[PDB]
Ligand binder design. Structure first.
Ligand code: HEM
Ligand SMILES: NC(=O)CCn1cnc2ccccc21
Length: 289
């Protein structure tokens, strides 16, 4: 099972920079969403959930096929709330119908990270929409009520190592949980990409509590929260060292996140030797827009 990247016919960097820009301008415009967080965080989560269905063993799932557009995956209980991201992207897809679904979903995540002042994420085009029967079954995305050993094992299926796992989890600086989506009660929320996930883990005074959906989560007096899988990163000694590294080196976190996130978004894709190089999109700010 091979998924070969195929450039949308006649398209080049500039074409995709126009899609980036349309996302980025809508992100700026539609600022009321989720008590003024805006859509950045949910777009990052979308890009991650369309990619995170991948299985290295048989190359099923992953971003390539754009299968989140199909009912089985759109209605996965793990994907509750991501409909908001899909709806945000709908006008963009209508404006630029030449782009594939998987390309759009993943570029939405890239755009959101960069526009939220995160690292540059190189991004490759050529994902090709696949039929409805290629949609992966529900249940391939991770549980939050688990420990470090569960997280480590789970991410082996995505070919991620300890450093890659700890780096990716830093996206949990963004946004918040919503009881109605996931059974977790959200805490202080932000829409700027920083290493604050690691700083909060190490510096806050955490208390284990049971929320109104009966689930355990870690809460701080300052109003922040951590999932049990987040907190696991300071329970396990291997994860803890990495957490400390990123809490103490913003640039290293940025560089490692960028690599991991691009890898996550490209898992399962075979890029021809003469495929275009990855694109690095300019932010609205870099363009003076
Ligand atoms: C063990 C792995 C992970 C678990 C169990 C997990 C679990 C969760 C849960 C339960 C939520 C709350 C959803 C809601 O209530 O709306 C959430 C939100 C979020 N997740 Fe994760 N996640 C994990 C990994 C990741 C990764 C790898 C990324 C991306 C790199 C990511 C990005 C986000 C974002 C940005 C949000 C905020 C969404 C919003 O504000 O709407 N997560 N996650
Ligand atoms: N320290 C925080 O409250 C950052 C927000 N946060 C912590 N864990 C999270 C998991 C998902 C979304 C946001 C999360």
């Amino acid at each position: 099972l091979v998924h070969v990247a195929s450039v949308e016919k006649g398209r080049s960097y500039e074409d995709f920079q126009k899609v980036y820009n349309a996302i980025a301008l809508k992100l700026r415009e539609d600022d009321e969403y989720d008590n003024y967080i805006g859509y950045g965080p949910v777009l990052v989560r979308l890009a991650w959930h369309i990619s995170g269905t991948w299985d290295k063993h048989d190359n099923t799932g992953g971003s390539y096929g754009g299968t989140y557009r199909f009912k089985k995956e759109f209605n996965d209980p793990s994907n509750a709330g991501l409909q908001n991201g899909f709806k945000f992207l709908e006008p963009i897809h209508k404006e630029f119908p030449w782009i594939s679904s998987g390309d759009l979903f993943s570029l939405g995540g890239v755009t959101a990270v960069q526009e939220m002042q995160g690292p540059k994420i190189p991004w490759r085009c050529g994902r090709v929409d696949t039929p409805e029967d290629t949609t992966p079954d529900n249940g391939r995305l991770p549980d939050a009520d688990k420990d470090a050993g569960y997280v480590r094992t789970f991410f082996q299926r995505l070919n991620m190592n300890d450093r890659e796992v700890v780096a990716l989890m830093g996206a949990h600086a963004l946004g918040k949980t919503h009881l109605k989506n996931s059974g977790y009660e959200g805490g202080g929320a932000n829409n700027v990409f920083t290493n604050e996930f690691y700083l909060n883990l190490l510096n806050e005074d955490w208390k284990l509590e049971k929320n109104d959906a009966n689930n355990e989560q870690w809460d701080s007096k300052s109003g922040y929260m951590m999932l049990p899988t987040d907190y696991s990163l300071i329970q396990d000694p291997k994860y803890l060292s990495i957490v400390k590294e990123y809490a103490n080196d913003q640039d290293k976190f940025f560089k490692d996140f960028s690599k991991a996130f691009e890898k996550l978004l490209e898992n399962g894709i075979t890029f021809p030797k003469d495929a275009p190089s990855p694109f690095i999109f300019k932010t609205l700010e870099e363009q003076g827009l």
